[PDB]
Each structure stands twice: as C-alpha cells, then as structure tokens.
C-alpha cells in the first residue's frame, strides 16, 4: 500500500492539486446567509443568522457582537452511523472555527448582538473542517455581514514523505501529517493566518513549505468563493430587474 506512485496520488491528482470543489450561495430561504459546498466527497451546508439579538442576557457584550459557530456532523455523514450531538472533536472544531471569524468579522458594529454561524456536514471525508470554513465564509458574505475580507481554508498533508494539498481520507488516516489552514484574504492576497493546526510529524522545513502549498491552494479556493458570490450578485440583480419586468 503506497500513497504516491509515479508522482500521482490514489485518485490521480498531483501533490499541489485540489479535489473538485462546488460552491453555491443563497440555497436556504430561512437564513440570512448561506452556502452549499462540496470539497471532494465533503457535502457541507452553511447557514448564517445575521446580527440578531442575543437572548441569554449574560452573553450580551455591551461593546460588540458575539460570534458563535457550531460545526456538526449528521449521523449519516460518516461510514459508521455517528451518534448525533456534540463530541469533543466537534466542540473543538467549533471553537477554532469561531475564533477564525472573530478576527475577520467586524463585530464592533453590532453591540449586544449575535452572529450565529451553523455548519452541517451531510457527507464527510477528510477536510470537512476546511470545507465548512469556506462554506461559512461564503455564507457570511451572502448574509452581507461586514468583514475585513474573506476566509479561505485548505489543509496540507504528508504522504510517503511528500507534502500534498487538500488530503483525502486515505491520506489523512495513513499519511504522516495533517495540517488544516485558513487565511484572511484582502486585495486578492493572502494577508494573515486565521486558523492553524497540525498533527503528525514534520520537519521545520516542511512546515514552512506547507504554508506555501496551502497558500497556493487557498488562493485557488478564494477564486471559487468570489465566483459563487459573483453569481449571487448576478441573480439578485436580474431579480430586481424581474419585479420591474
């Protein structure tokens, strides 16, 4: 069992190649913002409920909106029916995810408010965490909530000694390292790191090179995000012209 054979991975992609991605904004009616997202075999759905009033008074920040993010896996999203409800892994993912948007969302504009982000994975593969972030980010723009810029996420793995972009299920489970990333994008450029985590065994040199592969990947994903929002812009445009039509 070898992961890389002749420069190709078990699914045919090269080391620096993303799995096929599909992004659609405004797919939910009862949500301020939303987006459906497919990353490889990951089928993820994101929902955002625009600045609304936070109900439990003690969670009300007098000076800024509070961000809540819930990553959750559908019982049927994995190989073995998963018991519904939060687990240690989900709470964790929800926390770093919450934190990735806490630096990008302009919360000072909505005091005593709440911007709740819900992300559900209908089908999971490696990277679901990454897929939800890209979905959540699109969902947030669809909801028109102010942000310093976009948040694009991709993970980098290590297989048979080589760093690979957007690892798949066999690569995460049998590889040597998994490293999920997320950056803030401004002016079409990678500005800073919004999310960073890694498990495995990498050399200092491979960590720095990994940052480089993820950036190349994230920019590619960012383009796809911009496109999904572009279409949404074209649909609401031809909608305003519809009522007038």
């Amino acid at each position: 069992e070898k992961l890389i054979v002749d420069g190709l991975r078990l699914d045919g992609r090269k080391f620096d190649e993303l799995r096929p991605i599909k992004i659609e904004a405004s797919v939910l009616k009862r949500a301020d913002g939303s987006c459906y997202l497919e990353m490889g075999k990951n089928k993820v759905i994101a929902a955002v409920f625009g600045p609304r009033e936070v109900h439990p008074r003690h969670l009300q920040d007098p000076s800024k909106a509070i961000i809540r993010y819930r990553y959750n896996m559908a019982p049927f999203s994995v190989e073995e029916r998963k018991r519904p409800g939060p687990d240690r892994r989900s709470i964790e993912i929800s926390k770093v995810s919450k934190e990735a948007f806490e630096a990008v969302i302009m919360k000072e504009l909505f005091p005593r408010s709440a911007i709740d982000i819900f992300v559900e994975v209908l089908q999971a593969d490696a990277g679901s965490r990454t897929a939800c972030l890209n979905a959540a980010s699109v969902a947030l723009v669809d909801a028109g909530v102010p942000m310093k810029g976009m948040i694009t996420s991709v993970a980098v793995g290590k297989a048979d000694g080589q760093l690979v972009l957007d690892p798949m299920k066999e690569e995460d489970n049998f590889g040597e390292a998994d490293m999920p990333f997320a950056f803030l994008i401004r002016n079409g450029k990678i500005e800073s790191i919004a999310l960073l985590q890694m498990d495995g065994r990498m050399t200092r040199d491979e960590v720095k090179q990994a940052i480089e592969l993820a950036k190349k990947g994230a920019l590619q994903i960012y383009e796809m995000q911009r496109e999904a929002i572009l279409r949404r812009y074209i649909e609401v445009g031809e909608e305003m012209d519809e009522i007038t039509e």
Binding site: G50, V141, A143, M147, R186, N187
Partner: protein
C-alpha cells in the same frame, strides 16, 4: 465591473470619503461587504448584496408597546417597512402623547395600549416615534378584559366575544395584516 468582494482595495482614504460598506485601515479604503462599488461625490460606498437595514430618521417602523408611562410610551421596535431583515439598531423607542395625532389628548394609556402592535414613524434618534398620521397608529389591539384580539367597527375596537369597546389611535391598516 463594479462588483467588489469584502477585502478588495478601493483606494486611499485620501481620495475618497469612507461610506457605507467600506472600512479604513492603514490609510486604505477596503470593501467590507460584497456588492456594487459606487463613488458619488468623492464618497465611496458598496451596495451590499444583502443590506442590513439601519432604522434612520423618517422611515416607517413597526413595534409592540412594552410599557405605557403616564406621558411617555415605551415601544419595542422590531422592523423597518421595506425589508424583512431585522434592522441593526433595534430595541426600544419612545412615543410621547404629544406625538399621537396633532390633537390634544392627555393620557397615553388610552391612546396606545400595553402589548399593542404599533405602526410608527421615526422622528430623529433613539427611536423617537410619532403616529399623528392616518397611515400610522395601532395595528392590533388586545382586549384587557378577555385578552382576545379586537376587531374594528367605525373608529372603535369592539371586542367580538366580550363586547367591550376601547378607543385608541388606529392605523388605516388595522386588522389588515399589512403595514
């Protein structure tokens, strides 16, 4: 193409005045929301693809009276006619009997009611409401004796089951389900 994504650089804060949907940083103007970038009179702004309404001065609002002080009427503003998205600056506005119908009524308790859905207009800030117009007024009054909703009959709100009648500033859209 006038389309911009949040994060896209619009220009230096020297050349343009930061407008809606734009933020400044390091002397640079960026788009905070996705939409159409418009530069009218040096003022750069972005027409959001999903605007978040801000209840300003002069717009029609909708709310439920939270508590009626003797003169001041406390209303729980919720929406801004013209948009389904809950506005940002929601909360509780103030309605003074002086601003009810340009007429001279003393009590406020009889002009508006506790838990009455009201259709007001913004006067200035802190959600200063007014209802001296026909279009404005109460949209749904609940009887105090039987707690049931009251129907309109002439200029009075006659309760269907208990029969009791009440008199309060009524909107022309009363009982219509519209505003």
């Amino acid at each position: 193409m006038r389309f911009v994504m949040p994060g896209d650089r619009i220009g230096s804060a020297e050349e343009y005045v930061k407008g809606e949907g734009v933020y400044e940083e390091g002397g640079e103007l960026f788009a905070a929301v996705a939409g159409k970038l418009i530069i009218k009179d040096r003022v750069a702004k972005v027409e959001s693809i999903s605007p978040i309404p801000e209840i300003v001065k002069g717009d029609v609002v909708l709310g439920r009276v939270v508590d009626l002080r003797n003169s001041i009427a406390l209303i729980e503003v919720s929406s801004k006619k013209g948009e389904n998205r809950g506005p940002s600056n929601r909360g509780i506005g103030i309605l003074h009997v002086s601003n009810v119908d340009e007429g001279y009524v003393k009590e406020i308790s009889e002009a508006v009611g506790y838990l009455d859905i009201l259709k007001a207009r913004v006067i200035g800030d802190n959600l200063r409401l007014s209802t001296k117009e026909e279009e404005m007024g109460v949209l749904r009054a609940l009887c105090s004796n039987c707690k049931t909703e009251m129907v309109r009959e002439g200029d009075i709100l006659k309760c269907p089951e208990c029969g009791r009648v009440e008199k309060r500033k009524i909107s022309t859209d009363y009982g219509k389900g519209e505003w």
